[PDB]
Amino acid sequence: LAEALHCAL
């Protein structure tokens, strides 16, 4: 989740 979010942002 952490990295999915960082990518998305």
Question: Please, what's the largest Cα pairwise distance for the chain?
Answer: 12
Place of tokens 């952490």: 2
DSSP state of 9: -
Coil, strand or helix at 5: helix
Cα of first residue to Cα of last residue in the chain, in angstroms, is 12
CA distance 9 to 2: 11
State which H helix or E strand residue 1 sits in. Answer: none
